[PDB]
Structures are given as C-alpha cells and as structure tokens.
Amino acid sequence: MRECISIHVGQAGVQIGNACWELYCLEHGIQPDGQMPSDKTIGGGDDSFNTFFSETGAGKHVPRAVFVDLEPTVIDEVRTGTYRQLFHPEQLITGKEDAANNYARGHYTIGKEIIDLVLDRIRKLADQCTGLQGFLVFHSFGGGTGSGFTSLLMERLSVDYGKKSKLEFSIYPAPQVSTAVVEPYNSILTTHTTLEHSDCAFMVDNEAIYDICRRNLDIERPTYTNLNRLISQIVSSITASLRFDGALNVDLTEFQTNLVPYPRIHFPLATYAPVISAEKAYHEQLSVAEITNACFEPANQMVKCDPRHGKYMACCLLYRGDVVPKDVNAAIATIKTKRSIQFVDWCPTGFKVGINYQPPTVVPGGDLAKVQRAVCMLSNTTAIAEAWARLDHKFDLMYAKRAFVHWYVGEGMEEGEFSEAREDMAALEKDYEEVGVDS
Amino acid sequence: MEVIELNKCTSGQSFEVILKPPSDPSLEEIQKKLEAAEERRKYQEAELLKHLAE
Amino acid sequence: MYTFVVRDENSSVYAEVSRLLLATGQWKRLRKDNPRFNLMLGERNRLPFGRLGHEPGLVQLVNYYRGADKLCRKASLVKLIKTSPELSESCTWFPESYVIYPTTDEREVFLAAYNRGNVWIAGILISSEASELLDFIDEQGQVHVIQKYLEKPLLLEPGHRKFDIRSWVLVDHLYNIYLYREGVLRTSSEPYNSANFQDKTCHLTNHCIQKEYSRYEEGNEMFFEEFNQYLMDALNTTLENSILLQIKHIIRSCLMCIEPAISTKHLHYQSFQLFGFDFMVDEELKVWLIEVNGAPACAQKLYAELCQGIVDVAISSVFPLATSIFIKLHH
Amino acid sequence: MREIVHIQAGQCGNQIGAKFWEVISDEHGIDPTGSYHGDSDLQLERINVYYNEATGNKYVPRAILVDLEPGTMDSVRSGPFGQIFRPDNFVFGQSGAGNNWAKGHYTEGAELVDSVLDVVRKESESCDCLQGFQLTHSLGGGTGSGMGTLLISKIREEYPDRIMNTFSVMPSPKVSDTVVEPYNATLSVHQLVENTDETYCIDNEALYDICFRTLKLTTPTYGDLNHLVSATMSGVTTCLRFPGQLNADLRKLAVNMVPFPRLHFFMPGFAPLTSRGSQQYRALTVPELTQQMFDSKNMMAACDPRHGRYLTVAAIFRGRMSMKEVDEQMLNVQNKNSSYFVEWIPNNVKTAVCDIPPRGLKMSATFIGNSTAIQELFKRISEQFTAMFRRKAFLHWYTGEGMDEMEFTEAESNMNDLVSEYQQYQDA
Ligand SMILES: CC[C@]1(O)C[C@@H]2CN(CCc3c([nH]c4cc(F)ccc34)[C@@](C(=O)OC)(c3cc4c(cc3OC)N(C)[C@H]3[C@@](O)(C(=O)OC)[C@H](OC(C)=O)[C@]5(CC)C=CCN6CC[C@]43[C@@H]65)C2)C1
C-alpha cells in the first residue's frame, strides 16, 4: 500500500476538501473523532483505506491531509466545525491577510512568505509514509490563493518530490457564483505555470455543477454546500479505487497511464449519473443501460462541451453499486451504435471498467437521493478544449485594454508574463485541435 | 467486443473491453524568479515614497 | 425585446433576415462581439460554437449546425455516403464518386471500376479517359473528388439544354426538416453538347458560368409552375410525381443520417440552418444528388418569401413575438 | 480582524461622519454608550472592522475627528451618539480655514496635521490586520478639502501599502454660494486622482435634486441631504461589516471596481429614496429594487448613466428576499441594456445579498457604479474653474497663503486628463 496526500488550497479547495473528507469518513465507517470500529488493526495496518488515512495508537484514523488558506476564516471553520478532532493542528495552516483575488499577490508577494512553512508541514506527512505515491491538490482557478499559491506549491513539490505524482481537482470559474472579474486572468496564469507540474487535472466548471443542482436537484439558487456535496461524489468516484480493494486505477501513476497519453493534454472530462433529488417521492430506478447512456449527455458532464465534435484518447467507466460486466457490455453495445464516439486513430476504441459493489454513500440530509447503482465516466476527450477557448477569449477582451493588469504588475509581476501564459494556452488549444482534426 | 484482463475482488470487478484496435525549474531558478519580483515591487514602492517626499 | 449579432456581412440571405427582424420593433442588433445576444447569425469559417450556450439569462440560437459541414463539402459528402450504413452502396441517387489527393484516398480504387462508356468530372474539369483528369488534380493541391459525369441528362425544350435543380431546406432546433415549396432550375442558354464536352457553359449550369455566355428564362431561372406546366405538356406528368418525391426522399435521408451527430436536442445552445441542395434529373426521370450547400444564396424573385419563413419557422419559434411556405418532410 | 481607520475632517466631513456612525451603530446594536444590545450573532461577527473593544465589553468607533475650528466637534460631542467616540480622538484647532483650500493644505492645517497623525498612528499600531483608511469630507471647503487631502498624502507615505478610501462630497451652486468652491474642488480632485484607491463621489447637485424634485422637499436642509448620504454609506459598506463573499474588504473591492488606477471614482445609487421621517408603507419588489437603483434619478452623483458605459458595478441587496429573483433581475438588467456595459470586461457586474435590512426598510438596494459618465461631474467643476481662472479671479486668497498659479494649472490639467481618460474608454 502506497499513501496519498491531499492538499487543499484556498477557500474552494478547503471547503471542497471538507466535503470530501466527510464523504470519505462515511464510506469507511470512520466517526467524527477518527475512531473506526471496523478496523481491527488497532494502531495501524496497510489496508486499502490507509492510502488516505494514517493511524494513532489511541485508535485515531487521521486524514493524510493538509489545508492551507492565506486567511483564517475558512480553515477556522474546520478547526471548530464538526470534524475538528479528525485533523491535527499542524495540518491546518492559515495566514494573516489573503491574496485579494490577485494571482500575482498569491504567487509572488504573500506566497513567498509561507511556501516554506507549507512545504515543512507537508514533509512532516511524507515522513510518516512507507511508500508515498503522490499528491491530490484541490483548488480554484479564480481566487488569489487557489491560483497563485497553488502554482507556487506545485513548482516546489516537483523540485522536492520528482518521483511523485500530482493530480489536480480544479474548480473552473463561472459567473453565477464568482466574486471577481479578474478570474480569467488568474486562470490562464495558473494553468500556464502549473501545466508542466501536474500529471492529471480534473476540471470542474462551477457552471456545470450549478445547472445539475437546479435541473436535477430542484435547487432554486444552489449554494457552495450544494455544489460541494456533488463535487464530493464525483471526486469520491475518481478516488474510490485508491481506498478500496480493486485492480483498476490502483495508484496515481495509473490515472496517468489510463487517461493521459499526451502530457499536456492531461485534462480528462468527468461525467456522472444519476443525480436524483432525495426529495423525489419515489424514483423509478435507472438501469446500467440508462446510467451508462447518461454519460454521453452534455448535461451530465463536469464541463459543458460536445464530445461528438472531438476525438477520444481514453475512457474509464467507474461503477458503484449493483453492476455486473454483462450489463456493462450490453450497455456499451447499444450506445456504441446510438452515439458518436470516435477515438483518435493511434488509439483503440475501448473502455476500462471498474465496479465497486457498494452503492454510492449519501450524506444524511443532503440533496442527493440514495440510488442502487451509479457511474462516473473519465473520458479524455478533445471537446474539453471548448472550456479553454472561452476562458482565453475572456482574457483577450480584457487584456487588449490592460484592464486590471496594474494590480498584478503592482505586486512585482511583469506585464510580459501575461502574454507568456496566454501564448502557452494558444499552443495548448492548437495541440487540442491537431489531435481531433478529422471530420 | 473482447473482454480482457478481468479481475474480481469481493468489492467489485475490473476489466477492459476494446471494440476495435488502433491504426523543469529548480529551487535555485525559483528564488531568482521570486526575488526579482519582490525587487520590481520594492523599487516601485520606493519610487512612490520618493515622489511623496518631493 | 430580443437581441442578435451579425457576423457574416456577405450573406444576402441573412442581411434580409436581420432586416426583417429589425423591421419588427422587437429585435435589437448588438455589436458583433457583444456576448449578450439571443441570435448569432454566425460567420462562415470557424464559428466559435464552443462559446455559445454559456450566458445565463439568455437562450442562445445560432444559424449553423456544427458538424453540418460533413454534408456540405464534396470530399466529405462522398465519405459520408460510402462509410455510413444508412446510405452506403444502399444508394441509388448519388453518382459514383471517389476522393483523390494531388500527389486514405481512392485514386487506385477509382481506376478499378473505371475499367468499363466512362465519363467523369473534377475550376472543374470533365473528361472520358483518366490520365488528364488525375493529372488535373495533381496540378492543384486541395483534395478533389471524381464523380461519374451524367451523360444522358434530361434536356429542356425548346433549346435542348441541360439544367440542375436547387432546393432550400431549413432545419430548425427541433430538427424539423422543411422544404420551401418554391424551387429553381438553373438552366443553360446553349444546347447540350453530346459529342465533345471539354468546353463548358452548356454542361456546367452554374449561374455564373452562364451570365457570361448566354433567352427563354430571365437570368436563366426556371421556377416550378413553369417546369411543372412543361412536364405536363411534354412528358404527361407532374413535377411532384416525377421529381419532387425523389428529392424529398433524398433530403430526408441525408439529414436524418447525421441527426445524431449534429442535433441540439439537449444541448446548451440550439441551432437551425438553411441548406441548398442541388439535384440532376436524368433522361429516365431519375433524380441524382450533386452537392449540398451549407450557406445557400436565394434567387432574387424568392428572397422575400424564404426570408420571412426563416424568421417564422426558425427564429420566432424560439423567441416568439408580441398558410405555410414550407413542406415539413415527416420523419 | 481587517480593521478600517475612519477619519472625518471639516464641517461636512464631521457631520456626514457622525451620521454614518449613528446609523451603522444601530445596524450593529450599539447604544450611545458603546454597549452591545443586539438580537443576532450576525451583528457582532465583523464588528471589529469599525470598532475597538474595551473592558465592560464596550465598543468604541475606530474613528478620528478633525477640524481646524472648534464647533462641529462640540456639535458632535453633544449629538446623539456623541459620547461613544474616544475623547482623545477629537483633534481640533481654533483658527478655521475660511473655505480656503490653501489654509487647510499648507498653512493652518500644516500646524495641526501631526497631532492628527499621532492619533492615526496610535489607532493603527493597535490593529491585527489594517485594511486601510476611510475618510469623510467635502471638496468645496477649506478644512475637509485642503487639510483632508493633506492627511491622505501623509497617511499614504506612512502606510504606502494600505487602502485609502474616501467619501468625497462635491460642491454645487444649487446648494451653496461661495465663489471659490470650484477652486477647492479642483485642487482636491487632483489630490484624490493621485492618492486614493476608491472615492465615492457624493454630489451635492444630485442630493439636492433628489430632495427637491423627487422627494418634494421644497426647503431642503443639510439634514435632508445627509439622510440620503448615510443610507448610501451604510449601503456601500454592508459587504465590509457583515459576513459574505463579495467585496468583503477594501482591496477585494478595489480589485473588482478599479480597472485602471486613476478611474477610481464611483457613482453610488440607492433605492428606495426616502425623506427623513417618511413613514414607509410597502416594501419594494425585487424588480422595483433593481430598475430603480440603476435609474439616474437614484444616483448620488449628478451624471447620466445612458451618457456613458459602465466599467465595473457592485450591487448590494438588503432584507429577506429570493436569491433566484435577484439573480434573474440583475441578469435582465444587463441583458436588456447591454450596450451600457463595456464588452471588454466580461461579467463586470457583481452582486451580493445581505439578509439584515437597514433601519426602517424591509428591503433596499445599494448601487456602486464605476461609469465613464462621471466625466460629466468633472466637466461641470472644470467649467466653473476655468471661467474664474482664465482671469485669475480670486487667486489672491490662495497666492497669499504661499501658493503659486502653476499649482492651479496643474490641478486643472490633471482633472481635464481624467475626463479625456474616461472618454477614451467610453469610445473603445
Ligand atoms: C441642503 C443645504 C441648504 O439648505 C440648501 C439651500 C441653501 N442652503 C441654505 C438655506 C437657504 C435656501 N434659501 C435661502 C435664502 C436666504 F436668504 C437664507 C438661507 C437660504 C435654500 C432653501 O431652502 O430655499 C427655500 C435654497 C437656496 C438656493 C436654491 C434652492 C433652495 O431651496 C430649494 N437654488 C437652486 C439656488 C439659486 O441660486 C437658484 O435657483 O439657481 C440655481 C437660488 O436662486 C433663486 C431661488 O432665485 C438662490 C436662492 C437664495 C439665489 C442666490 C444663491 N443661491 C445659492 C443656493 C440657491 C440660492 C436651501 C443650504
């Protein structure tokens, strides 16, 4: 067993992190105080769930997690909230004032004054790891910390841990819930810097989460707790394989190998179904056919885009609940004739499939109903470059007038780093188009 | 069409199904980057304090 | 009030559309790069599809089906028919064609069936023995297609002249397939040249290569009431029975084939689009499909009517305001 | 605790400052003696943005009161909440400034400034995490105008990296009859253009019209004007004083509102408008809140929004209402009048909703626009300035304090540049 360390950066990473660790605990039967009756190795072990938890002589299972916000408001909630015994203080790291939705202030100005203390607290976790495999980094693109500190920490982690893997869970900026008009700036900036230090990035457009919450959960104006519970499920699906017995995606290097043939095109599209309101008065349960088909509907993706107008390089079906292979292939058979699922010549048309018999765990009281089977698809499609195009277009509109640029320059960043980052994204968009050029 | 690598636990199953075959900076350079920046800024601020003293 | 932007300034068709829409007091035109539109009359090239359907508060509708270029490019149309079960060699209405590259093409598979009264066609170039044809495509550098030339066309009288037929098909967001009831034959001024064709004007009936060499029709446009009245008197039939039934079956088959790849049923933006379909009626009254045009122009006589139908079928149906010129091809 | 140091200088500055303090004190549940008596944990969460605490669990406005003459101080000490202010925080002289900017900036106020700065630096050395400063003052007089901006130049030199914020009351011949006010405003605007991060332009032209026209108040008093001015100040500071996501500190606010450093002059707006003492009979609907607060008749600077384009915009709603309907209504505004928001700042309108309504309303909306239409404000003052200055009229009241004409030519130039600068981005 090889341990995985989570790193929650910024308000979004921290609040998403909190929801994941609550979902995680429910799933492995760990109580709000790290106690886990079902573990019979008191004091430790090397079970599959020890990749995400380490063990205390007195019986505590404590996340291999580190939270870091540049101000105290949010992590204070964790220090005081319901799961406060689960983390020990050394891993909740908070600063004085924040990065004011300014990438340059999180990377250059305030970052420098905290990078070392954070790397310290991280190495403390590596030291109690028999065979550490890599990092799971949770952050937003749009704030100052989540973009600019996160890109600084990444570059340090690559220097300090070359052998290790790093996956991202990245919250893509959406007007319906954004709190800054500079978010496209911070998003290009931190994607450019981080591209070469992240092995696999799971982008979640707050826009997509928001509509799923309105359309399928009947939530008038979804809040961050709605958004984050849904994100906790998608994320739990993608990490189920590292915390449970299985033979698919059993270590971070396999997300690389299964999903990412090209290092820069490391942004696989997640798709999840079924999302059912727990308020629905009885629900006609969905079939393997029905849930697997759902996976090719844009309205179920973590990023709106049209994978018909691009090619595939990889595709994973992660099932949870009551599923047997015959059904899955029966299902894949039908849709293969109904849908437009063209791969890139230099790749085979196939699906890797993972089934975990234990159905999706529902947060008691939450908005999600408890379904007898569920599925997350991880497809590396080129249609996800739609999301790059529209974010790059917003950057261009503002940048051609230098609007707000003076805030980043005022922190010591040179105007030129803007065009460098955007030039990268222009290359990245060309890469994407080359791969999917055919029809 | 072809089911490969089938593996079964008591938690679930794993397998592949293929329908058709085919056909870095250093802690050194990082400091020069950051310091140059806090440089570019401390100078801008001092340009400001100098104008304010005029 | 609805808003719309105009991003293809050389569209006679959508100049009239925006003219009508404005002429209603319920539509405003925006700066082309203002994101807060309801209707994009989009560009012809690299229309930014991925930017549509992400403006909250806005239902957005655009006048092109992404992916519809597979049906409207000559290299692609051929590949679409051949490599698609719903059409395939199941096809009796498309001339024999092959794609070819000026040195996954068919220049070798083309010679194969060539061993057999062989006349073919390529800015175009027709011939009877290959070599010269294959040589021509090797001259230029863009992919080229070589379909059998239709040796025995149906010839209008008086004149003994060749014609093609243009039908405009509108497809709305629901994927209704609408056939404007008025069509046009683009005739020829000079009589068809049985022996010897490498001259053109009298074979190629394109309006341009004929307002440059031309008598019986104004502008060389024969509309349907006259072509029907002619068919009755010379062939004892109707346009309906003889031609239109095959046209509808060709339009309906083509667009349903690609409907899974370009439908916008559950998409975050909607599409409609106007197609120009071009047909060839041969000696035996068998219709053949030539090209599909993704940005048709109209005929001057008919702009008024087709352009109000577009507004009513395709735009007012999605943004309603404060006895039909079309034939819905029921699939 | 991200604290804010409040400075109020001059008659106007001290009178709208004292009225800001009694209004937010209510909102937070502090009585004139500094004791909390509220019915909500929401009232105390961010209390330390504007207050200090002492033994007895009393709250003291983090506020400094400055005038070159001794009234007003007396007026404020003997006002409703007069007794809450730390007494050592009253800093005042005796001479006065005679509505003379040079007296405030250079001569009289020079003598007094350091005593103001020691209370400022005292209050600052006592802060966990200082956001910056907020000053209230007028531009038409001598003390708030000339000494107000002197203090901004000093404070910025001591705190070059904190945020400087002002509520700057602009003069209008509809309300006052001192001929030199256009001089004191143009010398002040030059200063504000160079040394503040955010300035709310409270225009006495717009406050007068709202009171006379809209509110039917045919003999308006300053208390009437200041009623509108404290509703606005309360409004535009909600996001700093309660919990929330949008614009919750001054730097956050500046990064959202200020796309270019000199264009930091804001049009406040508010709805519903109301006379002091106006019995309020029915709430507004969320759609009435919205169309109204973007209405020109509700702006606190006298400028026509439809004569410009909005660069950035912040909207604040207060009271129990539906997020869904606010969001739908804010979206319709931008979609129905979309040419009024520059297309090259995507999504330039940010919205917050606070549950706690202001005093006496069940529902209000506060608007903060950074519109190029505010050039109309600077053109009005520049035209009044030019008419006198082209004959150097009244200059001796200033040259006799030591000033030189050239300093006038420079203010006039830097403000004409500010106008031409707004015009640039209004065409673009
Ligand atoms: C909110 C703070 C204030 O209270 C607002 C004001 C002024 N102030 C003192 C109060 C006062 C007023 N009037 C007075 C006459 C006196 F002998 C002594 C005192 C006053 C005002 C009032 O209550 O009026 C009934 C009052 C005053 C004025 C006014 C309206 C108004 O109220 C609707 N105009 C719009 C101005 C005026 O120039 C014009 O029309 O052109 C624009 C006036 O010319 C006319 C009408 O002919 C007038 C009238 C004396 C002429 C000379 C100097 N201008 C300076 C202000 C202006 C005058 C209330 C501050």
Ligand SMILES: Nc1nc2c(ncn2[C@@H]2O[C@H](COP(=O)(O)OP(=O)(O)OP(=O)(O)O)[C@@H](O)[C@H]2O)c(=O)[nH]1
């Ligand atoms: N879905 C979701 N998105 C969030 C959440 N919190 C923050 N975000 C995203 O983050 C963006 C704002 O920037 P943040 O990443 O939160 O910045 P921060 O963590 O507050 O740190 P600062 O740089 O100091 O602002 C918003 O536009 C959101 O899209 C959350 O809890 N859930």
Ligand SMILES: Nc1nc2c(ncn2[C@@H]2O[C@H](COP(=O)(O)OP(=O)(O)O)[C@@H](O)[C@H]2O)c(=O)[nH]1
């Ligand atoms: N809105 C409002 N404006 C005021 C008030 N008091 C003064 N003013 C404005 O301020 C200008 C005079 O400035 P003044 O008070 O003499 O400045 P000071 O000498 O520095 O205190 C006038 O033109 C008024 O329009 C007030 O209570 N409310």
Ligand SMILES: [Ca+2]
């Ligand atoms: Ca164990």
Ligand SMILES: [Mg+2]
């Ligand atoms: Mg934060």
